[PDB]
Amino acid sequence: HMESADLRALAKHLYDSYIKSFPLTKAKARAILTGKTTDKSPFVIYDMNSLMMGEDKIKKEVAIRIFQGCQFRSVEAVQEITEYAKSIPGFVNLDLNDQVTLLKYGVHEIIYTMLASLMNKDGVLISEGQGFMTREFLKSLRKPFGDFMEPKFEFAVKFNALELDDSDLAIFIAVIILSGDRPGLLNVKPIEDIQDNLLQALELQLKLNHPESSQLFAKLLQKMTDLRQIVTEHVQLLQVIKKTETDMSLHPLLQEIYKD
Amino acid sequence: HMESADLRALAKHLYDSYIKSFPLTKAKARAILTGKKSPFVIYDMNSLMMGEDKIKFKHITKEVAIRIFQGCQFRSVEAVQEITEYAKSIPGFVNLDLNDQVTLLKYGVHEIIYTMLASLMNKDGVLISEGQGFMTREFLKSLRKPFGDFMEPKFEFAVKFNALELDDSDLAIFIAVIILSGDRPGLLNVKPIEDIQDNLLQALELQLKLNHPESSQLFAKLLQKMTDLRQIVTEHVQLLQVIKKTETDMSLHPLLQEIYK
Ligand SMILES: O=C(O)c1ccc(-c2nn(C(=O)c3c(Cl)cccc3C(F)(F)F)c3ccc(OC(F)(F)F)cc23)c(OCc2ccccc2)c1
């Protein structure tokens, strides 16, 4: 158990690191998506030829090229999430194998969480907000690739209705990483002591920052259910691609995360 | 939202109804499993045959692994009626759109069956027939083909879930929370369902702070288990498909197949 002033310090600690670790915040993403700004306007990709123009503007075959782009951005995201994780008080003091295990199982759940920040019902920001690729264009891609992004959009539309801001997400992201129920953890108890602290901070953070939003804490935790299901569908989709596209390689970092 | 004394009333209402609806409570099951009228123990093939002949289990009436697997289905269908009766006592439930009531039960019973199955389990086996029998985990795990591996994940879930040390008054409210999930496919009117679940969540949170004041963030930890429940339900569906498509001895009377659809 923690005193109320220590939880506020912990929330601020975490928000500060989240800003330092992730260059495209939700606040910046919403300013680009909402608009009314002439300096932050994205170039919009909705079909093949605007995709061609995007290369010229924002800097094989289309569906593959886009999918390879998503892999590259995922590797960067794992790198950003890994950096954030080291700042969670207690994480680096854990057994190394557990540090690796918590990241292996947490990074995708956090990626889809933060990907929601860059999404509205009509598409997703790309290339640090300089581009915007429509949900419709992604849904039209051939083979198995058309269905790769749609479950993420479905989650994001629901998840974004909670109206979390970055200061909320910073703590929620930390709660996800310090899950004591990950397969293969050696010392569950130190992980759960940390997550109790993180959960207490999130509970206090949500009550102060959304006092009119009843039971947001519970509703947000129930969303970890939706994250797990997206990870599993996605792994199953990668398996199909690996067994049908033999030209296509995965980054070792991604390859290692999905083994077992 | 709701005043604290109303949550205590809601918690007690749900506890009373949970008692009347389910024959074998967790308190009673825990008395039997710990050793506190000893149940008949099924640990191998011959003790199973004697259990049928002596105590006469209604779900044990083809071949052993199949007969056991179908028995689990019989009891699951009985449990669905018990859960359905309980849901009708959750304040607000029967005032929901009839299709939505049907949708919420349809998608909720699997998660509630596994939740309450844990009450009848420890690391060594499972109570059956309202506590009169006890089937060992080793015996279930030892079954052939996919049947051996069908049974083990429930024990793995149950051991972790039981570590939270919930009692029936906690579980009465948690069960109600599961049923009022606003994210089931095909719901027509989500708002009243989520309004009821907000009430239930407040009642559950207060129940857990009062009943387990030393167990910090138990409320949070219990909700995190809804991840494990959904994952095991989806695993479970995938295993039935594999059995249905591979096991030819698994056909019953057409009327029974209809009951168990
Ligand atoms: O009394 C009660 O509340 C109760 C409630 C559930 C079960 C029970 N359901 N079930 C399933 O498969 C299942 C599930 Cl979870 C959810 C939805 C649908 C099904 C279905 F597919 F079956 F339809 C089991 C599997 C294995 C099992 O044994 C175990 F867990 F592996 F050790 C017990 C179960 C139960 O079984 C008692 C029993 C055990 C052994 C022989 C005969 C009866 C009791």
Q: How far is the C-alpha of B50 from the C-alpha of B196, rounded, in Å?
A: 48
How many residues are recorded in chain A?
260
Mutation test of the interface with chain B: which of A221, A224, A230, choosing the one with the most B Cβ atoms within 10 A?
A221
Report CA-CA distances (Å) from B11 to A183, B87, B243: 34, 14, 40
CA of B76 to the centre of ligand 1 (A): 6
Helix (H) or strand (E) segment spanning residue A153: helix A150-160
A45 bridge partner residues: A133
Q: Which atom of ligand 1 is least distant from the CA of B71?
A: 42
A117 is annotated as contributing to ligand binding: no
Q: How far is the C-alpha of A149 from the C-alpha of A155, rounded, in Å?
A: 10
SS3 A58: helix
Closest residue by Cα to residue A203 from A219, A179, A181: A219
What is the bridge-based pairing of β-strands A131-134 and B40-42? unpaired
Q: How far is the C-alpha of B169 from the C-alpha of B251, rounded, in Å?
A: 40
The dihedrals phi and psi of A259, each to the nearest 5 degrees, come to -65, 120
The residues, ordered by sequence, that sit 6+ positions from B166 with a Cβ below 8 Å of its Cβ are B26, B174, B222
What are the DSSP calls for A216-253, one per residue? HHHHHHHHHHHHHHHHHHHHHHHHHHHTT-SS----HH
Closest residue by Cα to residue A46 from A57, A54, A38: A54
B132 is annotated as contributing to ligand binding: no
Q: How far is the C-alpha of A229 from the C-alpha of B137, rounded, in Å?
A: 28
The response to whether residue B112 sits with its C-beta less than 6 Å from ligand 1 reads: no
- Structural contact between residues B133 and B40, judged by C-beta atoms closer than 8 angstroms: yes
Helix (H) or strand (E) segment spanning residue A167: helix A166-177
| Helix B26-34 and helix B168-179, axial crossing angle in degrees, nearest 10 | 130
Contact B220 A203 (CB under 8 A): yes
Rg of chain A, C-alpha, whole Å? 19
Name the maximum alpha-carbon separation found in chain A.
57
- Structural contact between residues A46 and A137, judged by C-beta atoms closer than 8 angstroms: yes
Encoded tokens for B192: 């009243």
Number of domains in chain B: 1
Helix (H) or strand (E) segment spanning residue A124: strand A123-126
Closest residue by Cα to residue A116 from A171, A153, A71, A78: A153
B136 bridge partner residues: B125
- Which amino acid belongs to residue B54? K
The dihedrals phi and psi of B258, each to the nearest 5 degrees, come to -65, -40
What is the bridge-based pairing of β-strands B125-128 and B133-136? antiparallel
Encoded tokens for A222: 């129930």
Q: How far is the C-alpha of A192 from the C-alpha of B224, rounded, in Å?
A: 12
Rg of chain B, C-alpha, whole Å? 19
- B151 CA to chain A: closest CA distance, Å? 19
Residue tagged 């993420």 (tokens): A152
- Structural contact between residues A260 and A193, judged by C-beta atoms closer than 8 angstroms: no
The response to whether residue B126 sits with its C-beta less than 6 Å from ligand 1 reads: yes
Contact B230 A225 (CB under 8 A): yes
Encoded tokens for B211: 């009943």
- Classify residue A97 by its DSSP letter: H
The response to whether residue B65 sits with its C-beta less than 6 Å from ligand 1 reads: no
Closest residue by Cα to residue B200 from B184, B179, B218: B179
Structure-determination approach? X-ray
The response to whether residue B113 sits with its C-beta less than 6 Å from ligand 1 reads: yes
Closest residue by Cα to residue B118 from B161, B74, B88, B80: B161
Report CA-CA distances (Å) from B197 to A6, A72, A167, A218, B176: 31, 41, 26, 10, 8
CATH code for the domain in which residue B150 is found: 1.10.565.10
Q: How far apart are the first and last CA of chain A?
A: 35
Report CA-CA distances (Å) from B221 to A221, B67, B228: 9, 37, 11
Encoded tokens for A14: 């975490």
Q: Chain B: which residues have CB within 8 Å of chain A?
A: 1, 160, 183, 198, 201-202, 205, 216-217, 219-220, 223-224, 226-228, 230-231, 234
Residue tagged 């008080």 (tokens): A89
Closest residue by Cα to residue A227 from A117, A122, A114: A114
What is the bridge-based pairing of β-strands B40-42 and B125-128? unpaired
| Helix B147-162 and helix B64-87, axial crossing angle in degrees, nearest 10 | 40
Q: How far is the C-alpha of A11 from the C-alpha of A94, rounded, in Å?
A: 21
Question: SS in 3 state form for chain B?
Answer: CCCHHHHHHHHHHHHHHHHHHCCCCHHHHHHHHHCCCCCEEECCHHHHHHHHHHHCCCCCCCCHHHHHHHHHHHHHHHHHHHHHHHHCCCCCCCCCCHHHHHHHHHHHHHHHHHHHHHHCEECCEEEECCCCEEEEHHHHHCCCCCHHHHHHHHHHHHHHHHCCCCCHHHHHHHHHHHHCCCCCCCCCCHHHHHHHHHHHHHHHHHHHHHHCCCCCCHHHHHHHHHHHHHHHHHHHHHHHHHHHCCCCCCCCCHHHHHHCC
Resolution (angstroms) equals 2.3
